[PDB]
Amino acid sequence: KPRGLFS
Amino acid sequence: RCPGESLINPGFKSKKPAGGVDF
Amino acid sequence: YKYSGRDSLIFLVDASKAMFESQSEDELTPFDMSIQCIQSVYISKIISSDRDLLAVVFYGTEKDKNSVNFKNIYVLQELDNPGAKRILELDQFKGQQGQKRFQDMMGHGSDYSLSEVLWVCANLFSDVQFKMSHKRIMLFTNEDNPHGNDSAKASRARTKAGDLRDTGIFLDLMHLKKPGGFDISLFYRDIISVHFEESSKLEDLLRKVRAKETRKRALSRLKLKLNKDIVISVGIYNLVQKALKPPPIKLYRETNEPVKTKTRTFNTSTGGLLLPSDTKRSQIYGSRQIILEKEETEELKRFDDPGLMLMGFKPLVLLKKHHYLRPSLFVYPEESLVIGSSTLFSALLIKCLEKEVAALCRYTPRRNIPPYFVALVPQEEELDDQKIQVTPPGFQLVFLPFADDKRKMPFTEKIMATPEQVGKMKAIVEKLRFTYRSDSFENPVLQQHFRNLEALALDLMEPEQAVDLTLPKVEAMNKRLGSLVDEFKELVYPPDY
Amino acid sequence: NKAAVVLCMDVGFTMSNSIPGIESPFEQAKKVITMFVQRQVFAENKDEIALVLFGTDGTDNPLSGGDQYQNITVHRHLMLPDFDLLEDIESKIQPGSQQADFLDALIVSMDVIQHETIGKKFEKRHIEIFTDLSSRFSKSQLDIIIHSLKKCDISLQFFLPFSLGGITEQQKEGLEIVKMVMISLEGEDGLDEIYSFSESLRKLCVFKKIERHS
DNA sequence: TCTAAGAACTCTGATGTCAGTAGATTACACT
DNA sequence: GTGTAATCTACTGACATCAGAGTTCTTAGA
């Protein structure tokens, strides 16, 4: 599942 | 009318005697 | 009846020796039966409805207390809200020594007259100022012909009790195991609204049943805005709401007097009794301090005015029963506003049930509350139990979570059991089958709390300690189930635990 | 988790100029990183952020060079976010009149992560490149970079001004070069580390969900 | 080699609500 | 002016409810 900017 | 209405506390519906698990 | 009217109830015992000191057995006593009744309905009414009124009166006694029409009657207690000192006044007259304690005071077996007794009670109800919803008298006499030997005595009573019923005071009766017989058809046939041992009604006054009983009242009223323009008024009612032990009132030790918690706010440096305007509200984020007024920490959290805005329709299957927010509340029409809107609501109810549908809405119960989202599920009444309405017809507000509410839960994967491991379980489960009913259980704490509170209140000997109904009765679970725990211990896991 | 984030932002001249139906690729990227910074500016996560600017008319880095390691400013070191960073992002940042290389900025930024990840704690790590593909470069260190992105355990997210369903031949060829780099990193999942400024402004619209365990 | 940050539950206190009561204010009105 | 309506707006008891504060437990822990 999403991470980084999508944390 | 009489059938469901308690004599201790009128208009309110009669409180049935607690129950629990019993098979 | 209307909301505010108190229940009001007066207890009126035959003090006559022929019943008062009398038994066929030794094991009860009609006066000791009536006094027990009066103490026991009265201890029910104390926990359950401190607002509703009781009185108690002895007729045919020899020393008197009345306003007027005095002869041979003693009002032990005028009409009042119920409490401890009244229960202690009745306690004094109970038992084998009690039936002598009463004799040293009011005196026993003298002649009496129901047309005067009914006069007295009438004056009593008159004398009180409150609005009364139900006005009821309870007869504790066994004297089935009430000494109507003079029929021109008795016609006074029957006319006077016509006048009781005509003034919308009611009257009610209990017969008390008179030796050899009692029959209402001789007399009392026209005083109440084939032959008896002792009343099947009287055991209901010994139920000792405890709860608050709080009458039908709205939570709020709202407008169901279908769009920018069409509105109907609906009520919002609380069918299920968790009860709490009542709020405790802080007291002064040395006198038991109540005392005022009297909080102030004081500057840490100086004598400033800071007013609400002197101080703001704040947060810390990113090592800087954000400042807002006592107006705007509640201008934030505004979105809408009190109403219900319609959001369109869904299948009832897609409203998944695993995610549940807070207790469901009822919706029911109110012609108090928006007259004839009941005509729209009723069609809306009827036709949703055909469509297998819910309405979705956004809901604000007040000004300065955020909208939640709520599914209006439609509802239908099971009157089949001789019009005992187990379920009122209308809508349920069922609330729906938002993203923030549905908390993350850890990783796990398995599909582990074999058909034998289900197959043995399918037996134990079918052996343990009973019928739950909503009212079949009671709160162990809140029920225990009242019994402790009574012991302290009356100065009883003991807390009644009545054991709860939530513990599994494990010996029955041993026997009904039987030994089949071994099927798990043998067929499903190793012997190491 | 305690994360590393490194915004690696192209501030060359060219991204100031655009297809007239949108905001400039410069200010689009500036808005994306604004709509991002706000999130952890409020949310109580333990995540360090850094800013690197490239296409800068000056240069500031631990690794300075004449042609490579140049037209780059390591504008903000790897620490928890704050309101002054958000103000500097929202109001301070300028396009340079010059141009620079994202492969250039990437090596500097990845070496800064190799400095910062030793003296204080982390679990997961990211690098984040924002550009119009006006970078001109030799295809130099790439196999060692992709190998080292595994050996340093840092994922790369890449951000662009146009769709993945009026753009220059230089933007088409640049994207096939970005695809080739993410195919080399991760294969079929690798292109899902690539985002348009369009879809991301259409996804970063809101503050975070409140993060809590049971 | 253990000391706070993060939970969790109950309880207390204010704000807003509804129904009902009754006072004072404000219209209405005198030929 | 003087006097009698009709009727708005208050206050209270009571009930729900958010918030806020007091209290015991897990992990990370010199």
CATH of the domain at C272: 4.10.970.10
Nucleotide nearest residue C3, measured CA to C1': E19
Domain end point (choices C368, C402, C436): C402
Please list every residue in chain D whose beta carbon sits closer than 8 Å to the beta carbon of residue C286: 41, 81-83
Q: Which of C41, C386, C440 to probe the B interface (max B CBs under 10 A)? A: C440
Q: Is C14 a domain residue?
A: yes
Q: Which of C162, C76, C77, C58 is closest to C115 using CA atoms?
A: C162
**Chains A and B contact (Cβ–Cβ under 8 Å for 3 or more pairs):** no
Give D 66-125 residues with CB within 8 A of chain C.
81-83
Residue C279 CB closer than 7 angstroms to strand F?
no
Residue type, D22: I
Let me know how long chain B is.
Answer: 23
Residues C280 and C164 in one domain: no
Distance between C283 CA and the closest CA of chain D, angstroms: 11
Three-state secondary-structure class, residue D33: helix
D47 CA to E31 C1', in Å?
A: 90
What gap in Å lies between CA C392 and CA C365, rounded to an integer? Answer: 22
Are C201 and C314 members of one domain? no
- Taking each helix axis from N to C end, the angle separating C84-91 and C30-48, rounded to the nearest 10 degrees, works out to 170
Q: What's the rounded Cα separation, in Å, for the pair D30 and D119?
A: 30
Helix D102-119 / helix D142-151 crossing angle, nearest 10 deg: 20
CB contact under 8 A, D83 and C408: no
Please check whether residue C44 touches B, CB under 8 A.
yes
- d(C-alpha C142, C-alpha C186), whole Å: 13
| Inter-helix orientation angle C151-166/C114-127, to 10° | 20
- Sequence-distant (6+) residues with CB within 8 A of C360 are C310, C311, C312, C313, C314, C373, C374, C375, C376
Burial readout D176-204 (b: 16 or more C-beta within 10 A, e: otherwise) = eebeebbeebbeeebeebbbbbbebbeeb
Domain ranges (residues) in chain D: 3-207
Contact C392, C379 (CB under 8 A): yes
Pairing outcome for strands C6-14 and C53-59: parallel
d(CA D126, CA D45): 15
Whether C286 maps to a domain, the answer reads yes
Q: Which chain B residue is nearest to residue C41, measuring alpha carbons?
A: B8
C-alpha torsion sign, points C409, C410, C411, C414: negative
Q: How far apart (Å, rounded) are the C-alpha atoms in residues D38 and C314?
A: 36
Measured between alpha carbons, how far is B16 from B9 in angstroms, rounded to an integer?
A: 13
The token duo for C129 is: 């100022």
Q: Closest nt to C370 (CA→C1')?
A: F18
Work out the number of other CB atoms within 10 angstroms of the CB of residue C144.
17
Residues C377 and C485 in one domain: no
- Resolution in angstrom units: 4.4
Residues C294 and C379 reside in one and the same domain: no
Confirm whether C91 is domain-assigned. Answer: yes
Residue ranges of alpha helices (H) inside D43-101 are 83-87
Query: What is the distance between the terminal CA atoms of chain A, rounded to a whole angstrom?
Result: 9
Burial track C16-53 (b if 16+ CB lie within 10 A, e otherwise): bbebbbbeeeeeebbbbbbbbbbbbbbbbbbbbbeebb
Nearest residue, CA→C1' of F14:
C214
Task: Check if residue C129 sits with its Cβ under 7 angstroms from strand E.
Answer: no
Domain boundary among C402, C419, C453: C402
Residue C67 CA to residue C126 CA, distance in Å, equals 12
> Which secondary-structure segment (H or E) carries D162?
none
Q: Comparing C-alpha atoms, which of C228, C203, C14 is closest to residue C108?
A: C14
Q: In which element (H, E) is residue C374 found? A: strand C372-379
Q: Which residues contact B21 (CB under 8 A, 6 or more apart)?
A: C434, C472, C473, C476
Q: Give me the half-sphere count of Cα atoms (radius 13 Å) on the Cβ side of residue D129.
A: 29
CA distance B4 to chain C (A): 7
Please tell me the distance from the alpha carbon of residue D96 to that of residue D68, in angstroms, as a whole number: 17
Nearest to D137 by CA among D67, D72, D56, D194: D67
Same domain, C85 and C194: yes
The CATH number that domain D3-207 falls under is 3.40.50.410
Q: Tokens 């939570």 appear where? A: C219
Q: How far apart are CA C330 and CA C238, in angstroms?
A: 6
Q: Which residues contact residue C252 at a Cβ distance below 8 angstroms, ignoring those fewer than 6 apart?
A: C258, C259
Nearest-CB residue to C286 (from D83, D209, D210): D83
Tokens of residue D143, six digits: 């196999």
Assess whether chains A and C touch, using the rule of 3 or more C-beta pairs within 8 angstroms: no
Distance from C-alpha of C145 to C-alpha of C186, rounded to nearest angstrom: 7
Question: B-contacting residues of C 211-270, CB under 8 Å?
Answer: 211, 213, 215
| Lookup: tokens for D85 | 């960073």
C239 CB inside 7 Å of strand F:
no
Q: Chain A within 8 Å of D149 (Cβ-Cβ)? A: no
Q: Which residue has the tokens 């108190």?
A: C6
* Residue C435 to residue C30: CA distance in whole angstroms: 40
Are residues C87 and C28 part of one domain?
Answer: yes
Q: Is D31 on the interface with A (CB under 8 A)?
A: no
Nucleotides of F under 7 A from a protein CB: 14-20
Tell me how far CA of residue C94 lies from CA of C104, C239, C471, D78, D138, in angstroms.
14, 41, 36, 85, 108
Q: With an 8 Å Cβ cutoff, are B10 and C136 in contact?
A: yes
Please, is D2 exposed, middle or buried when counting C-beta atoms within 10 Å of its C-beta (0-12, 13-18, 19+)? middle
Nearest nucleotide from residue C263 CA, by C1' atom = E13
H runs (alpha helix) in C356-443? 419-431
**Cα distances (angstroms) measured from residue C237 to each of C85, C328, C396, D46, D123:** 37, 10, 10, 45, 51
Nearest Cα of chain D lies from the Cα of C287 at a distance, in angstroms, of 8
How were these coordinates obtained?
cryo-EM
Dist. CA C209–CA C126, nearest whole Å: 30
Indicate yes or no: CB of C407 within 8 angstroms of CB of D41: no
d(CA D72, CA D131): 14
DSSP C167-223: TT-EEEEE----SS---TTTTTTTT-----SS-TTGGGGG----S-------SEEEE
Q: Which of C11, C7, C8 is nearest to C174 (CA)?
A: C11
Q: Is C1 a domain residue?
A: no
Q: E12 C1' – C440 CA distance, angstroms?
A: 32
The answer to whether strand E lies under 7 Å from the CB of residue C263 is yes
Type of residue at D17:
N
Map tokens 């940042």 to a residue: D93
Which tokens belong to C351?
Answer: 């036709």
Specify the number of domains making up chain C.
Answer: 4
Rounded to 10°, the helix C444-458/C84-91 angle is 60
Looking at the structure, do residues C151 and C177 belong to the same domain, yes or no?
yes
C219 touches strand F (CB under 7 A): yes
List CB contacts (< 8 A) between C285 and chain D: 41-42, 83
**C-alpha–C-alpha distance, residues B1 and D170, integer Å:** 89
Taking the CA of residue C331 as centre, how many other CA atoms within 13 Å lie in the half-sphere pointing to its CB? 28
Tokens of D205: 């619209």
Amino acid, single-letter form, for residue C153: K
The beta-strand segments (E) located in C60-140 are 73-80, 132-140
C121 domain residue, yes or no: yes
Both C10 and C95 in one domain: the answer is yes
- Answer yes or no: are the C-beta atoms of D167 and D2 closer than 8 Å: no
Same domain, C266 and C246: yes
CATH number at residue C367: 2.40.290.10
Reply yes or no on whether C2 is catalytic: yes
Chain D within 8 Å of C286 (Cβ-Cβ)? yes
Residue D9 CB neighbour total at 10 angstroms: 28
> What domain range includes position C270?
242-304
